Amino acid sequence: AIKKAHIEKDFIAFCSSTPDNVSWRHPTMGSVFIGRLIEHMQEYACSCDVEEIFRKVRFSFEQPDGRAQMPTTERVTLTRCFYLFPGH
C-alpha cells in the first residue's frame, strides 16, 4: 500500500558564513572555510557525527582577526547522528 513520507528530512546545510556577510578565500590556498572543514574532517571523521564536526569548525572561527567569518549550519533536519565511520 501507499504510505506517507515527510517531504523534507535528513538534510543539513553548512554555509561558509552568515547572511549579508562575506567569506574569505586566498588566491594561493583557496577558501578558508573549505580548508578548515577538510582539516577537521580528516581528524574527527572517526569519532564525531558530521554535526559535532561542523560545530568544531565554527568554534575554530570564534576569534575574529581581520578576515573574520562565522559559518552556519542551516535547515538541519537530521533525525539522528551521522557517523562517517571512515575505514568502513
Binding site: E8, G35, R80, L84
Partner: protein, 167 residues
Amino acid sequence: GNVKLCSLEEAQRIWKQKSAEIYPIMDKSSRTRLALIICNEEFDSIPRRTGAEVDITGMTMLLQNLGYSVDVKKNLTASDMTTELEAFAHRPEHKTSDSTFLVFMSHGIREGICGKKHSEQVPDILQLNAIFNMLNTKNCPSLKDKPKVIIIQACRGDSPGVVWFKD
C-alpha cells in the same frame, strides 16, 4: 587515506552506545556512494575565483577518501546547475547508497549562489531553497531517510560581519 580511520573497537563502541539514534550505513562492499561538486572559477562578469583549483583538489580527494564517488562540474549557470542537480537526484547509484555529499563553491549574494553568467544587470543565482527542492522525498525518493550533507562556499553579502566593541 589521510582521513584518520575508525578502528573496529571504536566503530563497535560508537554503534554500541548510539545504535538506535544513528544512521545505518550500507556495507562497504556493496554500497555505491555519490558526491557532487559544482564550483565556478571563471565568470562572465565577476572577478575569477582565483585559487578555486586548490579547493576542488581538496574536497574531491577528501570525499573520495570518505568512500564517495566525486563527479566534478565547473563554471555553470543558474540553469545549467538546476539541470545538473536534477540529473543527480536521478542517478541510480543512490538506491544502493547510504548518503550523499553536495558541494557548491562560487561567488554569492544574500539570495544565493552565483552562476558563471551572473551580473548586476542580469542576475544568475541559485536560491538555496531550490537545492533542497531538487533532492527532497518528492524529486529524489532514492535518498529518502538518508543523510544529505550540503556544503556551500560563497559570500552571503558585502558586509564584513564584524562589529567593534571595546574591552
